Design a protein around this nucleic acid. Sequence first.
RNA 1: AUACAGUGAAACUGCGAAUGGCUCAUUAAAUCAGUUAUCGUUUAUUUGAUAGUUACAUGGUAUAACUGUGGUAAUUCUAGAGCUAAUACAUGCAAUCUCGACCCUUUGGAAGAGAUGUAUUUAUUAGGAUGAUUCAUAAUAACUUUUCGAAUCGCAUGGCCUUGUGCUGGCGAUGGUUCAUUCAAAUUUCUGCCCUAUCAACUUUCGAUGGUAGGAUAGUGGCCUACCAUGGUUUCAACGGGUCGGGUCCGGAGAGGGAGCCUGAGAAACG
Lengths: 206, 244, 405, 30, 137, 178, 170
Amino acid sequence: MKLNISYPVNGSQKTFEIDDEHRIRVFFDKRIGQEVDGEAVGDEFKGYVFKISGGNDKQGFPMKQGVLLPTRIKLLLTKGERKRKSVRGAIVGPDLAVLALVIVKKGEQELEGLTDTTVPKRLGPKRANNIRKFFGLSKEDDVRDFVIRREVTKGEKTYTKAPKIQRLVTPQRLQRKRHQRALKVRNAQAQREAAAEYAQLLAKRL
Amino acid sequence: ARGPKKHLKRLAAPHHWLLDKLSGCYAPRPSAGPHKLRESLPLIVFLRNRLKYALNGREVKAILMQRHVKVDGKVRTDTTYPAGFMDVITLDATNENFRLVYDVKGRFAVHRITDEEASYKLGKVKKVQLGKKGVPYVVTHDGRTIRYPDPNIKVNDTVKIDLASGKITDFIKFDAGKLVYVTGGRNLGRIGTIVHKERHDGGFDLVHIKDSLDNTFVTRLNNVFVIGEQGKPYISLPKGKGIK
Amino acid sequence: VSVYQVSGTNVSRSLPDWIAKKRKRQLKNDLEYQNRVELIQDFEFSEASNKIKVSRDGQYCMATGTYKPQIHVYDFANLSLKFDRHTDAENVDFTILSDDWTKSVHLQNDRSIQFQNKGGLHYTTRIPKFGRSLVYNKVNCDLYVGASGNELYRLNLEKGRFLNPFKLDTEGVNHVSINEVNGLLAAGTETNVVEFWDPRSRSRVSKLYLENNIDNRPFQVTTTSFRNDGLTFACGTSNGYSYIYDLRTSEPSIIKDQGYGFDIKKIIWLDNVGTENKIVTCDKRIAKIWDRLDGKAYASMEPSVDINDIEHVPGTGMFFTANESIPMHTYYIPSLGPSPRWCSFLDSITEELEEKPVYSNYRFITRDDVKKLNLTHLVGSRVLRAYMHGFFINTELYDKVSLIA
Amino acid sequence: KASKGRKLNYSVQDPIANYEAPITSGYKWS
Amino acid sequence: VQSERAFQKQPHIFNNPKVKTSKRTKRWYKNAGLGFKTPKTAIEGSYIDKKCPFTGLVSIRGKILTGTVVSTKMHRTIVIRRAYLHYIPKYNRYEKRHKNVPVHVSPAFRVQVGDIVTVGQCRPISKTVRFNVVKVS
Amino acid sequence: LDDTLFKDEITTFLTENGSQSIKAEDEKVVMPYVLRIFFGRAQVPPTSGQKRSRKIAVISVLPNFKKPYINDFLSLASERLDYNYFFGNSHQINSSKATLKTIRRMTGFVNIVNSTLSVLRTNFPLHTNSVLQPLIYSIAMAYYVLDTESTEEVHLRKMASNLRQQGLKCLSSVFEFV
Amino acid sequence: GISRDSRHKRSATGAKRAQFRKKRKFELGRQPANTKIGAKRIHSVRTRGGNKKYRALRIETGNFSWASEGISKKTRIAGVVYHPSNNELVRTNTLTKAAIVQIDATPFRQWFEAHYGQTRAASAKIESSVESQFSAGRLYACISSRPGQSGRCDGYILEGEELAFYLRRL
RNA sequence: AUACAGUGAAACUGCGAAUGGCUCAUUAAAUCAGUUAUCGUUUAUUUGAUAGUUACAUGGUAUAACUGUGGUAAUUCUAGAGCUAAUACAUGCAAUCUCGACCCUUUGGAAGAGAUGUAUUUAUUAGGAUGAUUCAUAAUAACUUUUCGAAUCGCAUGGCCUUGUGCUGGCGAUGGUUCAUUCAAAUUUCUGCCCUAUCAACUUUCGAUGGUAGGAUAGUGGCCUACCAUGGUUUCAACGGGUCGGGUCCGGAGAGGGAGCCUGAGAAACG
Ligand SMILES: [Mg+2]
Ligand SMILES: [Mg+2]
Ligand SMILES: [Mg+2]
């Protein structure tokens, strides 16, 4: 079966075709969430540890956690209403076309396509506190200087694009909060004045 | 139907709008608002079929959102906003002030008024009651809930509301000899003086009204709107002074 | 012996389940949430579950709910909910006439018998007085309904005819049960007597008077059950005492005390599993397994929430229990027998299972009952091992003091 | 009295007629 | 009066067992209006009737009708008969028609067969009772 | 500790004669923690109906305790207050102690006592060191701050007037019950 | 599938009215809630409009009010003892309005001994039957809030003619 | 435009999809026409009133579009990785008013005394409006898996100064608690042109009539359950039989079969 391996720390991923049945056997009878030792799989994976994460069978039906069968079943899967759809059992078996794995720990030798390479994070922080956490900025430092900027070159033109910071403290928000509080105070004063005038009207009438 | 209606077929519309039959298949449905559906004149009809300033719905819509209209001193932007009895419509650009009062025929009259009288309106105090925190209030016929009213005010009285501030400048008690306007029944649009109010406990009261000509008629109390003291109406009346 | 909780809430008895749902979002990160295995999807009711039974064919199960009163039917071949069906009033008891789930009869609490066919509610009929239990005689197609009043109603499915109701000497029938081998019906009256009836005729073959020496208190027969051997017979009492009778002799062969003073809710005969001499006597709080000959305790199931019904999948070591909890519990005692065919790999994960384990072994006594028995002087002694608000005494020593007292 | 079924009615009821058929074998013991 | 499984009391009226000022249990009553006098037996009675128009949670509003009592067998409720004349145009003549209206009657009224009673409308008290006996003569 | 289960847990765990109540042999070890756990809840601001409900609950569970335990709880309230010097000397205030912080702690203490009196009423256990002499010292603080402080310290003065109003009310109550 | 339509009933004259229309939503009724003593379990119901209803499927605690002293305390419910409509509700510990239940007497005893300093005398005097109930440890109270609808089971401790009548009925 | 800033595919949020249209099989007070009430109820929206009781602004307890790796014959089929946001989802914070000595000044200052959300449920106390209330409203004691009481956005940059970007701010939008108003909905009072006795009994034969308690309801109500009383209509025609409504408009009913569920203010939804 094909093994779709992923290294999340680098963000890399690659597929290895397997024809020998014996590493496939050490994969057998395991369950999603268990761990296996790479060396049994092959000397290249010696020292690695793989966590199984899913896969698809020869008819294209995915695998689901929690079901203790090696055979397909029609299960009432959600995303309120839930369809009844086919799903492969969670037990690895010979009927699996592709098995997905996540590398928990690195072994001795480096894989060509997964450990050696990296894929940078596509997007960076946008909320102010997330920027602070990313750069560990102190409260006195302003995030406005440390915003991630990405360069865009179209022909001979070049410009830097940066995201809009959300939940940033600006004079406008202070102004708005001040306005809300002042509005509340003004309303209370207006009601008090009306009540006093009403009492005076009744006093005149009496 | 299984829910609210949102259309109004032309023939089913209130007759007093005078909508052209050959115009089309529907008519403007007044949106929910201060005045009931059958007793209301949407701004679209008033601007288009009555004043003729706009030639179609689109032009009325443009007029409204230019913020040239003020209903009861406030700018409104809904084409089917339901203007009704004693509602002040102000067009500052043309410098026109209109008060919606029925004529003798029973249809809303295009009644121009000066500014100083346009500053205020009248409201029949349908309900009087204590609100939360023991704050007395009055419900007028156009929906405006006025708090801290004058104690003497009771049901069926009239209150003169200053449009700018929304407060009661003065009021008129319901009593014999008072000048009254009919807002319902077959005598709609007639003006007269109260003579006797027949009281039928738990039933619909009746009021006897004598016009200037000394003709007399009887109308249900719900349809009576005190407008002032005899010979001294607090508003300008349309032409004819509600006779016949 | 080893008892594993395959499914069921694993929180403290004091902690209710609904907060665990609220904790669920917070604890999504926790690894155990991924690792936990649910055997049947949605194997759970909104608030509580009342009764649970397994179809004879062995692939389908049916259950009843509290609100909205509903009727799940689970498909073992797919480990999933097949269909949920609402009802008018909450269920008190039912049976599955057919070998599959298709054909069933449900005695609700509003005095109405509802006949559920595969498509939907077929027909609803009403018995004259409130019902308490319901049994079906396969031989005559005559459905027998216990009632609050003395008379025990008879409904004939073949003829579609109410027939002449049996008349009992006493009022109130708590459970009814039909011996398969012989057709003997046993009716559990409110008073401490069980009246036996012949179905082919309409007569009273005899009435057995239950006698408990330990406690002078009045007690009600709450459950009955005939073993497949066609000779032995079990009784429950409202005092938490389970009797095993050989029908021929009037004397109780064995009397076992559950010791919590709670009414016995069901008796199940574990003859099919192999090593036939075992029996389950299920209480509000505990379901004990013990051997019919010696009276020695074999295993105990101590769920964190009240038990309303317990069911044993035939030929296997599995047990379902309808509880007052949101989920219905599933237990698996490997020693009894193999895991069911549909749970073929349940053995594989035995080590990952919870493996829950004194409380069944001893007899529980309240503080007040200690005063009644004048055992206050032993409070703090190694004889009285205090738990919760009461004290535990050896069953033998309890029998001794009670007679003296 | 008879209302609400409190008096037992022994008429045929069509929907439940022939709901299940009796087994011809009978009791296993003779 | 406590002739039933449940204790009949005017809801939310409280008699303080600690104080015990007066033997007379507190009793609440209201005037129905329309110039209709509340009888003194209702004021000083001891019955408990949730549907009594003078001591119960019911309001008289709507039509007021009159009729002649025809039957009183039902408990606290009676059957009145109203008669009128219907005009047949084909014969240009009139024929006497009747309709039976059941009504509720409070125990504070004593009503016999044949007397003339004025009833008032009230909220639906039962499958067919929509009125309340309010004056007997 | 959980906010959602707190009300139910109190009525099930601490109610006298309750099924899950602590056993007599185990009262000594457990109750010190229970007093500390409930003490924190007593420092919630009662800004909302539910929070008001919570504050009444913590004071409403007190009578379930035995009298020696109740005395301990009052001691925990007064541990933070420093009063021994005052009665040690000729009833004189230290100017250093005269701060807003002390008054704020003082108002917290007096507020606990007024709540506790209302629940326990005549059963309230009164001890000179645990309750009374902190209470008197707090009123003693109030007069000192009000006379000594100048007018510009309006907020500190108001915290003083509040302390006096509660303090004198507290004395009026404590005589009345006991 | 419960309905409140008046069409399926017979007319006053006895005519069997015919089916006019299929069942509608604005004539809905839902399955009853058999409140029982046990760990608090409540299921919410989305009713007509934005309003919401709570079904007290199970509950063990409730606010009970001593009217004579005008006090309210939260107490545990021991069990249902008598229910005016039916007794098979009394048997299964079913909780519903007008039910007579036994509540723990602890907090009221504590409040009494605190407020009056007794286990002056004239005010402390209480009905003999209530005092006997205190000595027993449980008090008879009547549930005054609809468990099915609001979701709470508050009520009041019996007293006076209430107490005499119900004790007789017991 | 060194946080973004013009325009903007994609996606997440919000609002709407119960209007409109089309066919007439059914049914003779069933709908329906007029007429009456809701002191017996729910109501998106509009309109008008209405909440002083870490903060120079919290978390991922977070994912979409998107980057990349695959399975399958295969779909508006799919699993494994990697991101990132809110009006999405969670969490959350030094004032006013009375009585007012001193009667000091007689508007006035003022020692001191006090008092201080909303919502659910129950218990208890007080009681301007209608013919009439256990109405409106207020108070006390507790209760709540219990709320709500701006961590929001556009445009503009004024007034002060104690020059810190210190304090104080203009016009709007979107929200939110309760009441009223409007659009509605649901029940409901009375009146209402066929032939009929060769249709004289009908209901009570799984509520018929009524009381009381409960359950359900948005509520009244046999609407449904328990117990109890034996009633209710009819020769003035009950019961039964035969023969779309009203005035293009207004109403009524209906769109694989039957059973069950789902959201929403409104549907047993043409989903
Ligand atoms: Mg919508
Ligand atoms: Mg608004
Ligand atoms: Mg009722």
